[PDB]
Design a protein around this nucleic acid. Structure first.
Ligand SMILES: [Zn+2]
Ligand SMILES: [Zn+2]
Ligand SMILES: [Zn+2]
Lengths: 254, 44, 49, 65, 48
RNA sequence: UUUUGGCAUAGUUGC
């Protein structure tokens, strides 16, 4: 009537992704962790844009929407930030937001690429990830783009720009020993990269007592967070959600 | 009000009484200048 | 894999890229409702304003 | 119009790869080789660069105002 | 009602304005109805 | 201090 004793084995760790394996766990917990990776890890992304002057071929909403998807290095600064609506400031402050300013005037006879390099933050710890660089817009001669922006804490459930992951590969039972999926012709199906079957075999023998365990993860970071940090913040956030629900339930019972 | 000529980009002032025409090209298409009221977008 | 439970789906889904087109008929141009509005001048019945 | 910042499906950054992609095509890469050189494995990401049309270049021919 | 005597038009009814409304335009340009035009023709001919 | 509006021809399009 109690918790499992889950175990971790990291099979690969780079700056782009972490690949690991969780054993001795329910499928629901593993899927919830996989889901929290996408929807509930808070990062910093541009969410307030004031355009002082735009002469580009792209209208203002296009530029703002593109700026929102710029990923920002939010490794440690995100934890000490607060959500803006929770912050008591007069709408903005260094404790709930990070200011950006962009001012690019193409006064030359060559197409000026306005990239992420031109985004200038008021905080050195929160820069564009590429700072090759993400192209915001291209400008002709005599075209100015001048705006300020603010980037705030949020998570991917609200909007996909706060999604830190760039694809979360998730798997379990690579040889289909549980027959949670039924191949009409198992011969035709290529082996998973985690399969332990020899090539003369196409499918592990059926396991009547099996249960899903040994879930294989490959979490790729878009760049806002290191993948280690993505997984750790995900587990911390899910634990925080469960503890808050525990507090509310204790209040409701009392 | 300031209008921008549609052929030679010259910002020129025009009253609400005179016919519109570029004062250094003679062109007959003018565009209003962008508003100076603050415009704010969420980046969503 | 089922997005909610994370379980494998029993059947194997046909999936791949395909060219799709967003037709001009958005809902926001087709939604309307009438209640006590501008009737006709001759027929005293509701009219398309 | 212009290259999207993110792949629509997986959300991988693909906006900083258009210029490099074109550069690799000027290096006489096959388009598969160029996409591999840029580290785009999932065909969701490969679809982005492989099917993008950079119409903004055509739009910068017209005069500014 | 409906004596045959009354089938021949001796006096013609004039509909009210609610049947032939004069729609106002572009300020005070009163556009008349086709019925009003036919009645204008009929009253001119009957005056003659 | 609380407004109101062209119509009736043709075309195109949706189920
Ligand atoms: Zn604040
Ligand atoms: Zn002119
Ligand atoms: Zn992708």
């Amino acid at each position: 009537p109690y918790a499992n004793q889950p175990t971790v084995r990291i099979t690969e760790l780079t700056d782009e992704n972490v690949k690991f394996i969780i054993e001795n766990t329910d499928l629901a917990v593993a899927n919830s962790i996989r889901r929290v990776f996408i929807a509930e890890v808070p990062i910093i992304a541009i969410d307030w844009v004031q355009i002082d002057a735009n002469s580009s071929v792209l209208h203002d909403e296009f530029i703002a929407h593109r700026l929102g998807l710029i990923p920002l290095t939010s490794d440690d600064i995100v934890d000490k930030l607060q959500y803006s609506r929770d912050c008591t400031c007069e709408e903005f402050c260094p404790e709930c937001s990070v200011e950006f300013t962009l001012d690019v005037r193409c006064n030359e006879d060559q197409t000026r690429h306005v990239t992420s390099r031109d985004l200038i933050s008021n905080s050195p710890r929160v820069i564009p990830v590429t700072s090759d660089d993400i192209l915001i817009v291209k400008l002709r001669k005599g075209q100015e783009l001048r705006l300020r922006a603010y980037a705030k804490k949020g998570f991917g459930k609200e909007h996909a720009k706060w999604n830190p992951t760039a694809g979360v590969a998730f798997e379990y039972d690579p040889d289909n020993a549980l027959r949670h999926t039924v191949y009409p012709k198992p011969e035709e199906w290529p082996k998973s990269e985690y399969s332990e079957l020899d090539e003369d075999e196409s499918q592990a023998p059926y396991d009547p007592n099996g249960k899903p365990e040994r879930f294989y993860y490959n979490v790729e970071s878009c760049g806002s967070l290191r993948p280690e940090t993505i997984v750790l913040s995900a587990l911390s956030g899910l634990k925080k959600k469960l503890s808050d629900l525990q507090t509310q339930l204790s209040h409701e019972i009392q | 009000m300031i209008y921008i000529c549609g052929e030679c980009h010259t910002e020129n002032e025009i009253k609400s009484r005179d016919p519109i025409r570029c004062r250094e090209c003679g062109y007959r298409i003018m565009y209003k200048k962008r508003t100076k009221r603050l415009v704010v977008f969420d980046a969503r | 894999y089922n997005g909610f439970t994370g379980r494998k789906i029993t059947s194997q889904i046909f999936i791949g890229p395909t060219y799709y087109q967003r037709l001009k008929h958005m809902v926001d141009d087709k939604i309307h409702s009438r209640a006590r509005g501008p009737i006709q001048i001759l027929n005293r019945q509701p009219m398309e304003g | 119009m212009i290259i999207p910042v993110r792949c629509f499906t997986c959300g991988k950054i693909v906006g900083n790869k258009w210029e490099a992609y074109l550069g690799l095509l000027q290096a006489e890469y096959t388009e598969g080789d160029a996409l591999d050189a840029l580290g785009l494995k999932r065909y969701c990401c490969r679809r982005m660069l492989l099917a993008h049309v950079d119409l903004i270049e055509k739009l910068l021919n017209y005069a500014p105002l | 009602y409906a004596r045959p005597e009354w089938m021949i038009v001796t006096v013609l009814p004039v509909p009210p304005l609610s049947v032939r409304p004069a729609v106002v335009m572009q300020g005070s340009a009163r556009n008349q109805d086709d019925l009003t035009h036919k009645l204008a023709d009929i009253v001119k001919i009957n005056n003659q």
